[PDB]
Design an enzyme around this catalytic site. Structure first.
Site, PDB file in Angstrom:
ATOM      1  CD  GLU A  43      35.645  20.170  40.151  1.00 57.20           C
ATOM      2  OE1 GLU A  43      35.249  20.862  39.183  1.00 57.20           O
ATOM      3  OE2 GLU A  43      36.731  20.383  40.728  1.00 57.20           O
ATOM      4  N   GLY A 116      35.984  22.183  31.522  1.00 54.05           N
ATOM      5  CA  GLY A 116      35.712  20.987  30.750  1.00 54.05           C
ATOM      6  C   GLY A 116      34.347  20.393  31.034  1.00 54.05           C
ATOM      7  CB  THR A 117      32.579  19.548  34.170  1.00 51.93           C
ATOM      8  OG1 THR A 117      33.808  18.967  34.618  1.00 51.93           O
ATOM      9  CG2 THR A 117      31.444  18.595  34.481  1.00 51.93           C
ATOM     10  CB  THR A 151      40.650  31.816  36.177  1.00 47.58           C
ATOM     11  OG1 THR A 151      39.716  31.013  35.448  1.00 47.58           O
ATOM     12  CG2 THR A 151      39.915  32.967  36.828  1.00 47.58           C
ATOM     13  CG  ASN A 178      33.565  35.557  35.563  1.00 43.78           C
ATOM     14  OD1 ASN A 178      32.371  35.357  35.362  1.00 43.78           O
ATOM     15  ND2 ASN A 178      34.412  34.583  35.860  1.00 43.78           N
ATOM     16  CG  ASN A 200      27.888  32.394  42.079  1.00 30.69           C
ATOM     17  OD1 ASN A 200      28.394  32.907  41.083  1.00 30.69           O
ATOM     18  ND2 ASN A 200      28.390  31.314  42.658  1.00 30.69           N
ATOM     19  CD  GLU A 226       4.103  35.674  25.415  1.00 30.54           C
ATOM     20  OE1 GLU A 226       4.444  36.445  24.497  1.00 30.54           O
ATOM     21  OE2 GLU A 226       2.911  35.401  25.671  1.00 30.54           O
TER      22      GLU A 226
HETATM   23  N1  GTP Z   1      30.134  33.454  38.137  1.00 29.45           N
HETATM   24  C1  GTP Z   1      30.855  32.428  38.569  1.00 29.45           C
HETATM   25  N2  GTP Z   1      31.762  31.814  37.731  1.00 29.45           N
HETATM   26  C2  GTP Z   1      32.499  30.768  38.171  1.00 29.45           C
HETATM   27  C3  GTP Z   1      32.345  30.306  39.465  1.00 29.45           C
HETATM   28  N3  GTP Z   1      33.187  29.271  39.647  1.00 29.45           N
HETATM   29  C4  GTP Z   1      33.862  29.058  38.499  1.00 29.45           C
HETATM   30  N4  GTP Z   1      33.465  29.993  37.582  1.00 29.45           N
HETATM   31  C5  GTP Z   1      33.942  30.082  36.194  1.00 29.45           C
HETATM   32  O1  GTP Z   1      34.212  28.781  35.724  1.00 29.45           O
HETATM   33  C6  GTP Z   1      35.276  28.796  34.807  1.00 29.45           C
HETATM   34  C7  GTP Z   1      36.039  27.478  34.887  1.00 29.45           C
HETATM   35  O2  GTP Z   1      35.152  26.392  35.047  1.00 29.45           O
HETATM   36  P1  GTP Z   1      34.799  25.798  36.502  1.00 29.45           P
HETATM   37  O3  GTP Z   1      33.315  25.892  36.742  1.00 29.45           O
HETATM   38  O4  GTP Z   1      35.572  26.526  37.572  1.00 29.45           O
HETATM   39  O5  GTP Z   1      35.235  24.254  36.455  1.00 29.45           O
HETATM   40  P2  GTP Z   1      34.355  23.253  35.570  1.00 29.45           P
HETATM   41  O6  GTP Z   1      33.485  24.025  34.616  1.00 29.45           O
HETATM   42  O7  GTP Z   1      33.516  22.386  36.465  1.00 29.45           O
HETATM   43  O8  GTP Z   1      35.433  22.335  34.814  1.00 29.45           O
HETATM   44  P3  GTP Z   1      36.482  21.421  35.614  1.00 29.45           P
HETATM   45  O9  GTP Z   1      37.527  22.274  36.303  1.00 29.45           O
HETATM   46  O10 GTP Z   1      37.151  20.503  34.626  1.00 29.45           O
HETATM   47  O11 GTP Z   1      35.723  20.610  36.628  1.00 29.45           O
HETATM   48  C8  GTP Z   1      36.128  29.986  35.202  1.00 29.45           C
HETATM   49  O12 GTP Z   1      36.461  30.722  34.052  1.00 29.45           O
HETATM   50  C9  GTP Z   1      35.258  30.827  36.110  1.00 29.45           C
HETATM   51  O13 GTP Z   1      35.048  32.087  35.527  1.00 29.45           O
HETATM   52  C10 GTP Z   1      31.435  30.920  40.307  1.00 29.45           C
HETATM   53  O14 GTP Z   1      31.296  30.520  41.456  1.00 29.45           O
HETATM   54  N5  GTP Z   1      30.690  31.983  39.857  1.00 29.45           N
HETATM   55 MG    MG Z   2      35.445  22.181  37.377  1.00 27.13          MG
END
Ligand code: GTP
Ligand code: MG
Ligand code: GDP
Ligand code: GDP
Lengths: 409, 35, 32, 426, 426
Positions: A43, A116-117, A151, A178, A200, A226
């Site tokens: 995305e 997924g990504t 989520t 989380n 973060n 190490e």
């Molecule tokens: N610690 C932390 N976790 C995040 C954050 N944003 C998303 N997540 C975690 O990411 C998980 C879902 O994956 P995302 O990163 O949101 O989306 P993606 O991995 O890019 O996959 P797509 O939606 O297909 O693009 C959720 O369970 C969130 O807990 C963030 O800013 N900080």
């Molecule tokens: Mg995503």
């Protein structure tokens, strides 16, 4: 000596957006980072927020990789259908980043396995990195889904299917939930309404504390090679609980008397772990303690003695010397707008135990229940998968459970 | 017409829900001794 | 018209019973 | 980048779409004359999802009006935001079907469906990365239901990989305008279960009921009802148009709410909805938005979800909010009301947060629950359909047009097997 | 944290509550608009007990108005501080009971009380830690007595572990507004002795007596009576809202004043209450507050305690005072008049001080005494009940609604054994 960082997904590059902010704010010592990075996602929305943000000129334009359309919480889509066209462009850049380098310690990858990504093309990137370099370390700091706070819906499918490759590709894997971090910000940081930004920021603190040994001269330095020996007693057991101390606000910090003895203790209570699991059920296999700032070797030495003589926590019967210490001189830096106060000294502990064997077992039922009725399976199969890899990833985690139970005895 | 079948469905479901409610009361009453 | 009243009474009773069941389930979760 | 082509059919589709393009044009800051006049930078970079830059800053919508009667086209062209469409996109027959599904699906569609396909193709390949199509129609009328349904089938034959949204209203016996509602709705659903990707079910009972109870309007004309439906449609595709802390596109929501391929009929709700006299007597917090979301008296369908169980549910949030509060609220409603949710699926709620609120508000939310209470309407329809078809009422108006008796039996068969699979999964 | 949800029933409840919300909001510095305009930071610390912040300084009262005729609802929104209540909290019937306890408890209650319960649930779960509920109503009318008492019974079986105050004016022969007063009072008290945690007896006769001698008012309309009652209610719950040298909460008062679970009928008085002609000639010390407190002609009931015996008594003081003086005054009034006190309980008086006076005075006090003389009302009411029921007067309006004869005999027995049981501990 330099180490480059890869960031995948919505969670990956937002973690990186805070991590690199800390690196620039912290800085010849810079040579290991100055950036040697790559953001990549399917995305374009979050990457192009960086392209127009405050750090427009900081990142070279090509670095920020961005696909055309998202995998949409679909491991198969982000691993077989859409990954296949972007992963080649990404790793054929990372190569010339390594050719720019000369003394590469390793790579470090940031991904969340729920999506997924972060999950799909995470594993895909890892598989071509392992066949291309093999020997060079790849530290993967992943974000697993919490037991009760969640989520998405199909994330059990993603987490199992991602783990099957996270075993034999990454070298050192740090879990981070989380809910545990939410609890940390609620308990210690007393932030009752936290968002992803605060999470973060303190994740970056952990990363900085384990690379500061390369960047700055300490009393006892420790490289990435190490951790490779001192914490993984078996080639397939590398999953690390994380902790940090003192996670403390701006006012409480001045009131309390931070020292080495009590923060070595505070880094061991389950009220301060970065992963929602209780290590009282488990036995510590090995511990690693990064000390930053105002540390003499005596009190760190005295502190590990008190831990060993306590009986609230136990070690495996195998390790009398179950620790690895490390001391660095420069104190941790602060970010304006951040919530952590300035401290003379901090501790980042990375351990290994059998408490992690509980999270996989907890994960198994949720995946098992959905899979038995074949929920959501038609999405992944039409993407290019079959029933074979669902069942075989299931039995891989079953083997891992027996493995932890065997080693823990 | 069709309401005659609806009353059967609703009656049987209500009775089965009472059986589930009964068993759950024993469960909480069983855990309260263990506490 | 009679059967209509039976429908609107059985559902309300069914609804009350479902709400009580949820309460019992919640207590078990907290107590465990 | 990601592209949404808009297609409106029939009187219901045209007037719903008219109010839709009013609120989207205001969101992107485009004037009724077609030129950009917004203030924030954020409103420029994501207008290609809905518009095309023509010449001299003329942003024309990527929409296709479609009907069989000129009254709707002239009423569209008359009002404001009527002179922003390209007059070539007003593809338009001349005879009119008139609440006869056979006319709109076999006789009159046969000469219009060629022209709409020409326009939608040229309008589709004009953009690079198509995300999907977005259709707004009805299931009681003829030129909306029949032609729109036939257009859905032809489109899914050409573009089988691209997404597809359908905002469709269904008839209910309490608000029954035409006499042949069951004959149309039953046949229309037969095609929707195999052609659409997901269908967000609407109805007028819940809409009229919502404006009575919650909004407390005095005279709810079609303008206000169409205003509510448009607010739902803007909420479902806010993720593409604006950056957020957690993004969820069309495909992302589809895979998290559809556990089986034929189970793609949703219920919709929008929050916050408050009377004008009480707008200042309330807070704006996430818990307040959640209480109004999970109210069964707030769905925009006449099907009480507490009469069944939720399979899945989705909540798209807009505004500066803490993600922890989002997950804690979803978990709280998942534990206390444990019987109303399916058991062999934990985590029946997908959530998402966007950073840009709708204009005029601080924080909004959109609910999409895929429940098993939706089967009551299909039974509520099939009982009427059998009442007519046991005795061949009104049947000749369709039979002398091409439908045979096997078509109606097939429609009953598909309706009956569907209600059994919802009952199975409850 | 400690929280009180307020419930007003019937016409009597609505005027009492109306003047009450003006007095509290003026204490917390909130103007009629509902926005904060005070100065002291202390006024903001303890507004969670009675109000909810909505947005931009808007504070809404945590109250529920409940009645059957719209005249009272419109009279509330008309007057000042009428625009502060949330319009959804005006849960409200339409037909009217009209001084018929059976109509208030069996016919119209059965369809209104589910609604008022649902509002109360939202108001109770909206807050975190309930301290109790606060219900103001009368015992002569129908929509206050029968419906309000049913609400009390329903709530007590819902939240059994929380306190509950009810302020009830009771009928007397000298102030006889309706004709069936005893038939309403006797059945209402039967339910109060088995449901309410503690009651505070009031009457209109004593209030008229207070306005004649102490206030020396020319035209005592109902506004002044409601003013006295409001000052009492604010005085008792002042401890939760402001800090003091010796704080005494509602539960602390209940366990300290109720020796036996059935002996929970109190008579209340308030000081200082002086006419404008003599308010200039007065002094403000502890002894002058006490000897005006413990005067029999200052009680707000027509039950002279010296015709009985004191079980326990309580005084809630407000203002910067010396606790030594407080305790020695209670000691003096208990040692001199030792016969008026119970013998098998030493130190019959619970005392407390709070450090925030009401606006317009420098020092005030509030007396709550649990005497045994309250039985004068029970005998005084039961004989009028007997005088009609021996002869079956007005009975058919009660009988033809669902009540039978054993309800009156059971109610007679319970009231009669109650006055008997007060007499035994006397
Ligand atoms: N610690 C932390 N976790 C995040 C954050 N944003 C998303 N997540 C975690 O990411 C998980 C879902 O994956 P995302 O990163 O949101 O989306 P993606 O991995 O890019 O996959 P797509 O939606 O297909 O693009 C959720 O369970 C969130 O807990 C963030 O800013 N900080
Ligand atoms: Mg995503
Ligand atoms: N919400 C809404 N519904 C409408 C509108 N116009 C018609 N309808 C509904 O559409 C149904 C009739 O559909 P119709 O207009 O005849 O469809 P068509 O003839 O195929 O274009 C009726 O049940 C109406 O309730 C409108 O402007 N808004
Ligand atoms: N103190 C006071 N008492 C009132 C007021 N209005 C009515 N009453 C009392 O209410 C009693 C009659 O009850 P009513 O108002 O008919 O109760 P309802 O019909 O159940 O709401 C009379 O004895 C009055 O003394 C008021 O404004 N102040």
């Amino acid at each position: 000596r330099e180490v480059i960082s890869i960031h995948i997904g919505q969670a990956g590059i937002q973690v990186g957006n805070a991590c690199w902010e800390l690196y620039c704010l912290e800085h010849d010592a810079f040579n290991t980072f100055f950036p040697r990075c790559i953001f990549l996602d399917l995305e374009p929305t979050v990457v192009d927020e960086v392209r127009t943000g405050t750090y427009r000129q900081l990142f070279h334009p090509e670095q920020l990789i961005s696909g055309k359309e998202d995998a949409a919480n679909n491991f198969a889509r982000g691993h077989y259908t859409i990954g296949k066209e972007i992963v080649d462009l990404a790793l054929d850049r990372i190569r010339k980043l390594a050719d720019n380098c000369t003394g590469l310690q390793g790579f470090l990858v940031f991904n969340a396995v729920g999506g997924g990504t972060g999950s799909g093309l995470g594993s895909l990137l890892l598989e071509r990195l392992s066949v291309d370099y093999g020997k060079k370390s790849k530290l993967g700091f992943t974000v697993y889904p919490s037991p009760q706070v969640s989520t998405a819906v199909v994330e059990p499918y993603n987490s199992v299917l991602s783990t099957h490759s996270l075993l034999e590709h990454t070298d050192v894997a740090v879990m981070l939930d989380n809910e545990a971090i939410y609890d940390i910000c609620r308990r210690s940081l007393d932030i009752e309404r936290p968002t992803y930004t605060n999470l973060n920021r303190l994740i970056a603190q952990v990363i900085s504390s384990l690379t500061a040994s390369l960047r700055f001269d300490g009393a006892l330095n420790v490289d990435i090679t190490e951790f490779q020996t001192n914490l993984v007693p078996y080639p397939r057991i590398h999953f690390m609980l994380s902790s940090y101390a003192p996670i403390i606000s701006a006012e409480k910090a001045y009131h309390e008397q931070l020292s080495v003895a009590e923060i070595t203790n505070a880094a061991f209570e389950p009220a301060s772990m970065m992963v929602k699991c209780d290590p009282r059920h488990g036995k510590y296999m090995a511990c690693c303690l990064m000390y930053r700032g105002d540390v003499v070797p005596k009190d760190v030495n005295a502190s590990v003695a008190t831990i060993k003589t306590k009986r609230t926590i136990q070690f495996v019967d195998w390790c009398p010397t179950g620790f690895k210490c490390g001391i660095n001189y420069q104190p941790p830096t602060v970010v304006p707008g951040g919530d952590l106060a300035k401290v003379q000294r901090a501790v980042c502990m990375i351990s290994n135990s059998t408490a992690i064997g509980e999270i996989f077992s907890r994960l198994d039922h949720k995946f098992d229940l959905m899979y038995a009725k074949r929920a959501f399976v038609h999405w992944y199969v039409g993407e290019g998968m079959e029933e074979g890899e669902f069942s075989e990833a299931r039995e891989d985690l079953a083997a891992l459970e027996k493995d932890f139970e065997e080693v823990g005895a | 017409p069709f309401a005659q079948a609806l009353i059967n469905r609703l009656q049987d479901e209500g009775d089965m829900l009472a059986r589930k409610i009964v068993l759950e009361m024993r469960k909480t009453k069983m855990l309260d001794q263990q506490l | 018209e009679a059967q209509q009243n039976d429908i609107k009474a059985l559902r309300r009773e069914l609804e009350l019973k479902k709400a009580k069941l949820n309460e019992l389930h919640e207590d078990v979760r907290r107590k465990e | 980048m990601r592209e949404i082509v808009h297609i409106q059919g029939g009187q219901c589709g045209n007037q719903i779409g008219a109010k839709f393009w009013e609120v989207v044009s205001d969101e992107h800051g485009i004037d009724p004359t077609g030129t950009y006049h917004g203030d924030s930078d954020l409103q420029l970079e994501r207008i290609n999802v809905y518009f095309n830059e023509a010449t001299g800053g003329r942003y024309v919508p990527r929409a296709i009006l479609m009907d069989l009667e000129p009254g709707t086209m002239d009423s569209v062209r008359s009002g404001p935001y009527g002179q922003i469409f390209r007059p070539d996109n007003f593809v338009f027959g001349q005879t009119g079907a008139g609440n006869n599904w056979a006319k709109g699906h076999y006789t009159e569609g046969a000469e219009l469906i060629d022209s709409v396909l020409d326009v939608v193709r040229k309008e589709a390949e004009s953009c690079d990365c198509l995300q999907g199509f977005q259709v707004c129609h009805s299931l009681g009328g003829g030129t909306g239901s029949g032609m729109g349904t036939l257009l859905i089938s032809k489109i899914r034959e050409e573009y089988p990989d691209r997404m597809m949204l359908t905002f469709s209203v269904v008839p209910s016996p309490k608000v029954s305008d035409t006499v042949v509602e069951p004959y149309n709705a039953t046949l229309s659903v037969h095609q929707l279960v195999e052609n659409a990707d997901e269908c967000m079910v609407l109805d007028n009972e819940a809409l009229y009921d919502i404006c009575f109870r919650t909004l407390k309007l005095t005279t709810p004309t079609f303008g206000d009802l169409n205003h509510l439906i448009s607010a739902v449609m803007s909420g479902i595709t806010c993720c593409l148009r604006f950056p957020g802390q957690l993004n969820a596109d069309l495909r992302k929501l589809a895979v998290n709410l559809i556990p089986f391929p034929r189970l793609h009929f949703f219920m919709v709700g929008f929050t916050p909805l408050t009377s004008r006299g009480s707008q200042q007597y309330r807070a704006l917090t996430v818990p307040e938005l959640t209480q109004q979301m999970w109210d069964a008296k707030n769905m925009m369908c006449a099907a009480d979800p507490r009469h069944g169980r939720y399979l899945t549910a989705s909540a798209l949030f807009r505004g500066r909010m803490s993600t922890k509060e989002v997950d804690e609220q979803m978990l709280n409603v998942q534990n206390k009301n444990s019987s109303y949710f399916v058991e062999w699926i934990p985590n029946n709620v997908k959530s998402s947060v966007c950073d840009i609120p709708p204009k005029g508000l601080k924080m909004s939310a959109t609910f999409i629950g895929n429940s098993t209470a939706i089967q009551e309407m299909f039974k509520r329809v099939s009982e009427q359909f059998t009442a007519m078809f046991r005795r061949k009422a009104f049947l000749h108006w369709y039979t002398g047009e091409g439908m045979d008796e096997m078509e109606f039996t097939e429609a009953e068969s598909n309706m009956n097997d569907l209600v059994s699979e919802y009952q199975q999964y409850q």
